[PDB]
Design a protein around this ligand. Sequence first.
Ligand SMILES: Nc1ncnc2c1ncn2[C@@H]1O[C@H](COP(=O)(O)OP(=O)(O)O)[C@@H](O)[C@H]1O
Ligand SMILES: Nc1ncnc2c1ncn2[C@@H]1O[C@H](COP(=O)(O)OP(=O)(O)O)[C@@H](O)[C@H]1O
Ligand SMILES: [Zn+2]
Ligand SMILES: [Zn+2]
Lengths: 178, 166
Amino acid sequence: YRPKDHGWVEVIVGPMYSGKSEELIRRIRRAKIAKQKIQVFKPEEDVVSHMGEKEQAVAIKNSREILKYFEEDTEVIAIDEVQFFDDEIVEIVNKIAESGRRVICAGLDMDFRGKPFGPIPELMAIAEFVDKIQAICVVCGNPATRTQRLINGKPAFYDDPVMESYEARCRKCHVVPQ
Amino acid sequence: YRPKDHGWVEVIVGPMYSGKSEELIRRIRRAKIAKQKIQVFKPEAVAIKNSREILKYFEEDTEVIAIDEVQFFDDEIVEIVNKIAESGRRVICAGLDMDFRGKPFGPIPELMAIAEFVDKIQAICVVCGNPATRTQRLINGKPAFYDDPVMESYEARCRKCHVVPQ
Ligand SMILES: Nc1ncnc2c1ncn2[C@@H]1O[C@H](COP(=O)(O)OP(=O)(O)O)[C@@H](O)[C@H]1O
Ligand SMILES: Nc1ncnc2c1ncn2[C@@H]1O[C@H](COP(=O)(O)OP(=O)(O)O)[C@@H](O)[C@H]1O
Ligand SMILES: [Zn+2]
Ligand SMILES: [Zn+2]
């Protein structure tokens, strides 16, 4: 599988602190050891993980800029914090994969309300590889799959726009008052 | 993990022939061996129409709810499934992730987004032998065009081998 000049899209998703950046960095370093030219992208320049490690990346204001900074020489494209890019990133990523290159996307699957977040849903449907990873619930210790938003130390309301903190929780402990 | 009365949603996706039904059926037999009451639904073992009709047939006695061919249900399915999981029960969904054009199929994107477990499985490409991730629609043995409405056949293919003229 994965023969040369055959492209695909792989996605890494989960709540905050699930380890998306850590994993993205892991795959980035492996590609480099494999001697494959790779370009890393992040929104508005290093991709950093809460656990320590970091990798050089090119910050970009929007999805379109990917094609602008894209060098035909690169074999692997890595994109972090994907939940913030507009929906055009989907066709852009699909196009890169169709061109015979590998695209690695990492990002939140849901927002603090537990609702499908941005492009990730569509990216998961079209990607050849999907890895949904879990964090640990700071409340009970079981695997956390939701990001809990807190204001003054208490759960934020559903219809609450954007003193405030975030933490990973499981479905049971995640609280979203509406 | 996933102890008593802790519910969740698990999804099984992939192209035709990837093995979704086989996997779903396997999980249903396992739950039965675990002595768990299970109810099965389809877009029409309990065939049904829309998604709001699941709540109707739903017996509070059941611990596991299986939904096959999920990509055919309306978007309400997402809410219902989440609700069943929120009530402490297990929901197993199986469905195509993309249509023949390779476009996200129905509520699949949103279900994968909210699901705790996501398994994307592959078939074998009848053209080259590599893992197949797409469903190829054929009319008279030729690739169906991008804008073709509903001899016709389907087969699993690799990304490279999938052909969708536009
Ligand atoms: N609740 C938590 N669950 C798991 N890891 C946590 C948690 N809180 C802090 N961490 C630490 O933070 C790291 C988060 O990885 P990171 O890649 O930055 O996450 P993500 O990009 O998914 O938000 C973990 O490897 C762990 O050492
Ligand atoms: N191209 C193919 N790739 C893989 N399996 C195939 C293919 N064509 C036929 N099969 C057979 O069909 C079975 C498909 O499983 P099934 O659960 O019916 O698929 P799905 O529900 O995903 O459409 C396989 O286990 C295999 O024996
Ligand atoms: Zn918890
Ligand atoms: Zn093929």
